[PDB]
Every structure is written in C-alpha cells, then in structure tokens.
Amino acid sequence: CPLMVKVLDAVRGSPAINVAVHVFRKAADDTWEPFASGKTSESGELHGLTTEEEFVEGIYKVEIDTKSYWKALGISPFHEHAEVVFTANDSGPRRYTIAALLSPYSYSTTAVVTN
Amino acid sequence: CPLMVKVLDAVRGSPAINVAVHVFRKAADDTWEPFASGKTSESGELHGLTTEEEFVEGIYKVEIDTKSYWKALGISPFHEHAEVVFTANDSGPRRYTIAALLSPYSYSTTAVVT
Amino acid sequence: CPLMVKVLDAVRGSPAINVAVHVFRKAADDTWEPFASGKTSESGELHGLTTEEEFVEGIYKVEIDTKSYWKALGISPFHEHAEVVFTANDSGPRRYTIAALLSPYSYSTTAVVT
Amino acid sequence: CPLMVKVLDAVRGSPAINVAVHVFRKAADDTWEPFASGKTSESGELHGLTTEEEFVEGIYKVEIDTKSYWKALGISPFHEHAEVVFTANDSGPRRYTIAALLSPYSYSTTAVVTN
Numbered sequence: 001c002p003l004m005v006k007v008l009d010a011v012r013g014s015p016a017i018n019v020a021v022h023v024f025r026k027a028a029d030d031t032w033e034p035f036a037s038g039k040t041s042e043s044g045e046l047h048g049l050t051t052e053e054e055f056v057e058g059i060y061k062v063e064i065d066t067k068s069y070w071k072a073l074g075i076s077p078f079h080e081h082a083e084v085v086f087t088a089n090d091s092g093p094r095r096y097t098i099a100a101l102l103s104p105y106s107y108s109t110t111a112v113v114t115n
Numbered sequence: 116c117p118l119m120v121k122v123l124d125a126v127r128g129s130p131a132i133n134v135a136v137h138v139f140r141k142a143a144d145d146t147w148e149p150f151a152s153g154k155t156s157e158s159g160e161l162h163g164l165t166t167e168e169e170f171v172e173g174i175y176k177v178e179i180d181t182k183s184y185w186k187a188l189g190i191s192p193f194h195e196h197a198e199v200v201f202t203a204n205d206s207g208p209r210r211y212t213i214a215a216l217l218s219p220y221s222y223s224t225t226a227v228v229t
Numbered sequence: 230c231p232l233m234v235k236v237l238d239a240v241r242g243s244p245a246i247n248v249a250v251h252v253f254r255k256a257a258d259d260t261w262e263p264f265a266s267g268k269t270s271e272s273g274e275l276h277g278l279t280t281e282e283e284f285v286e287g288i289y290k291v292e293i294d295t296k297s298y299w300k301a302l303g304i305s306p307f308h309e310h311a312e313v314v315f316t317a318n319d320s321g322p323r324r325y326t327i328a329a330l331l332s333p334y335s336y337s338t339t340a341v342v343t
Numbered sequence: 344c345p346l347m348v349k350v351l352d353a354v355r356g357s358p359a360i361n362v363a364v365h366v367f368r369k370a371a372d373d374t375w376e377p378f379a380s381g382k383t384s385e386s387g388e389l390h391g392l393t394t395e396e397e398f399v400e401g402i403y404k405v406e407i408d409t410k411s412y413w414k415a416l417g418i419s420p421f422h423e424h425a426e427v428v429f430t431a432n433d434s435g436p437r438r439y440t441i442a443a444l445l446s447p448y449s450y451s452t453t454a455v456v457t458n
C-alpha cells in the first residue's frame with residue numbers, strides 16, 4: 001500500500017470519517033487525470049487507493065473534500081478542499097502517508113515517506 | 116487591501132522571504148485564470164494583490180511556490196507548492212488574511228477573516 | 230517590544246480575543262516565577278509584556294489559557310492551556326513572536342525570531 | 344492502551360524516533376508527580392505508558408523532549424519541550440492519542456479521544 005491518507009478532525013478530536021478523497025496524476029500534457037478516489041473509513045484512513053505497479057513516477061494531486069465534510073456538520077468552512085501536490089517515486093518506489101488535520105478555517109498536511 | 120498573504124518558515128523561525136505567490140480566480144468554464152501575483156517581502160508578507168473593486172465573489176486559488184523556497188535553502192521539499200482554494204463571499208466588509216506555515220514535509224494554512 | 234504573542238482561532242477564522250496569557254521565568258531553584266501577563270486584544274495580539282532591559286537570557290514559559298477561551302464559546306476543549314517553553318538567548322538583537330493557532334482539540338505554536 | 348503518543352518530524356517527513364516522553368499527573372496538592380515515561384519507537388509511537396486501572400481521573404501533562412531530538416540532528420530548536428496538559432477520564436474512561444508534529448521552531452499537537 002504505497003499511498004495512504006489519514007484525516008483527523010481538530011474540532012471534535014476524532015478521525016474525520018467519510019471524507020471524500022480524489023487523487024489525480026499530471027498527464028503527458030499537463031492536465032490532471034483522475035487516478036484514484038475513495039472515502040476515509042471510521043478510523044479516518046483511506047487505504048487501497050493504488051498498487052505499486054500502477055503508482056509510477058509522476059506528479060500527483062491529492063484533493064481532500066473538506067468542504068462537504070464541514071457542511072455535513074453544520075459548519076461553514078473557509079476552504080473548498082485541501083490539496084496536496086507532490087512528485088512521487090522520482091528516485092524509486094516509496095510509501096507515502098498523507099496526513100491532514102482539519103479545522104473549519106485551517107488545515108495542516110504532512111507527508112511521511114518510507115522506503 | 117482585501118487579500119493578504121503571510122508565509123512563515125517553521126525550520127528557521129523566520130518570515131519566508133521572496134516566496135512567489137500566484138492567485139487565480141475560477142472562470143465561467145471550470146478554468147483557472149491568473150488574477151494576481153507577487154513575492155513575499157522581508158516580513159514574509161504580500162499586500163496589494165488586489166482591490167475591493169476587483170475582488171468580487173468567486174472561487175480563488177492561492178498558490179505558494181514552496182518548492183523553490185526550500186530549494187534555495189538546500190533543503191529537499193515534499194510539496195510542489197501549497198494551494199489554498201476558497202470562496203470569497205463578501206457578505207459584510209471582509210479582509211482575508213491567508214497565512215501559511217512552511218516545513219519541508221508539512222505546511223499549515225489558516226485564514227483570518229476580519 | 231522583545232516578546233509578542235499572537236493567538237488565532239482556527240474554528241471561527243478570527244483573532245482569539247480576550248485570551249489570558251501568563252509568562253513565567255524559571256528561577257534559580259527549578260521554580261517558575263510570574264513574569265508578565267495580559268489578555269489578547271481585538272487583533273488577538275499581546276504587546277508590552279516586557280522590555281529589553283528586563284527580558285534577560287533565561288528559560289521562559291508562555292501559558293495561554295485556551296480552556297476559558299473555548300468555554301466562553303460553548304465549545305468543550307481538550308487542553309487545560311497551551312504552554313510554550315523556550316530559552317531566550319539574546320545573541321544579537323532579537324524580537325520573539327510567539328504565535329498560537331487554537332482548535333478545541335489541537336493547537337499549533339510557532340516562534341518567529343527576527 | 345488508554346494513552347498513546349505519536350510524534351512525526353516535519354523536516355524529514357518521517358516518524359520522530361527515540362523521542363523521550365514523560366507523563367505527569369497533578370497530585371492532591373498541585374505538584375506534578377511522575378506518572379510514566381518512555382521513548383518513541385521506530386514508528387514514532389509510544390504505547391504501554393499505562394493501564395486502564397492506573398489511568399484514573401485527573402490532570403495529566405505529557406512532556407515531549409523535542410530539544411534533545413533536534414540537537415541530536417544538529418538543529419538548534421526554539422522550544423525546550425512540547426507539553427500537552429489535559430483533564431483525562433472526568434466522565435469515564437477514554438482512550439487518548441496525543442499526536443505531535445515537530446519542526447525546529449514550531450510544533451502542533453492534536454488529541455484523538457475515543458470511547
């Protein structure tokens with residue numbers, strides 16, 4: 001599992017459950033093509049987005065649909081979504097964990113990259 | 116000044132200076148049009164991006180070129196850039212401050228709307 | 230102004246106003262002595278805590294009463310307060326800005342030393 | 344396992360390994376008494392600090408020795424340590440995960456609290 005997303009809710013002190021996540025890969029022309037998508041589980045995690053074989057070198061965008069999340073909670077948040085754009089696997093296969101911490105007007109994102 | 120950006124460096128404990136910032140507005144056809152751009156100053160701030168007249172309701176993207184910033188410091192960064200996408204909503208008089216706190220493998224962004 | 234505190238509210242996207250802040254210096258015998266205190270202003274800032282003459286090298290603790298802040302907003306917080314403990318080091322002319330970004334179950338603090 | 348600590352390094356994009364963590368409990372007089380201590384593992388996690396039986400209601404302070412961590416890496420950091428002070432178990436036993444994200448001049452801490 002080379003690409004994992006973990007999302008926490010800083011207002012409730014809990015995992016952010018059912019957050020939609022879309023991943024895109026920058027194509028040979030500089031259009032973002034859809035790559036994978038999913039929703040966080042009860043633990044706020046999203047696994048199984050892709051495989052080592054499919055997860056080739058490139059620039060990827062992970063888009064976390066934070067707006068829908070906060071709206072469903074009755075909070076009107078600032079951001080449309082949180083997005084994380086990174087070059088992946090440019091010197092060999094790595095495992096990427098993209099973690100995000102969400103508040104209505106703020107989010108933080110961190111990457112843990114393992115060999 | 117309806118839109119201000121402030122960028123801090125969490126590694127050195129200093130403003131992030133000379134960081135390129137590009138602002139885009141979403142156009143009618145799903146597409147991002149250049150709207151404003153600048154480089155953060157010595158205090159890590161960027162002002163005078165736009166005016167109240169010009170800054171109408173819409174979806175905006177603030178793109179902070181964090182990669183070049185870290186590269187200049189000889190530190191290999193994770194992100195291609197930091198992006199902040201938000202709807203400017205205009206109901207009442209509103210100043211938007213977009214602040215980013217930069218680390219090589221992490222960033223945080225917060226909006227202060229006053 | 231050698232020491233400044235700024236507190237932001239990540240839930241409402243606003244300065245955190247009227248937040249009590251207490252600053253302590255570590256004394257000779259391992260113990261924390263009151264040093265300065267105040268309440269953040271309408272811009273979520275606290276200035277004039279101390280002077281250059283008084284702010285000597287030492288270990289300082291900045292305690293931000295985040296609990297009362299959230300309680301006033303009817304939101305149950307996790308932390309008793311936020312604490313920031315650092316050595317003031319004085320080598321060269323230095324202003325310390327301590328910024329805190331508050332959420333009910335999380336906070337971030339960063340230091341800007343310029 | 345009612346109290347867990349997870350520590351990440353935002354400079355290296357990796358878990359923060361071998362970070363010393365001391366936990367204190369506020370005593371019947373308002374002195375912090377030592378409660379538990381340990382070091383983060385290779386995954387940046389610290390488990391087994393305490394048991395449900397021992398982890399009674401009270402105010403706890405988790406102190407993360409960030410200074411030693413950064414010094415061992417040749418970075419001179421700002422903070423002496425990161426500390427998280429919270430009331431625990433005041434309406435029944437909960438499981439607490441204290442997560443911290445470390446940079447030389449900044450850290451963030453979040454709590455995930457589960458039933």
Ligand SMILES: Oc1c(Cl)cc(-c2ccc(Cl)c(Cl)c2Cl)cc1Cl
Pocket residue numbers: 006008097098099100101108109110112349351442443444451452453
């Ligand atoms: O800011 C944070 C961010 Cl963005 C993520 C985490 C975090 C907490 C628990 C886990 Cl298990 C992981 Cl992977 C992360 Cl990255 C913790 C903090 Cl304090």
Ligand SMILES: Oc1c(Cl)cc(-c2ccc(Cl)c(Cl)c2Cl)cc1Cl
Pocket residue numbers: 121123212214215216223224225227235237328329330337338339
């Ligand atoms: O995480 C933070 C972020 Cl994203 C921003 C700031 C911050 C520091 C100084 C200033 Cl002047 C401002 Cl407006 C901000 Cl929002 C402080 C922290 Cl701790």
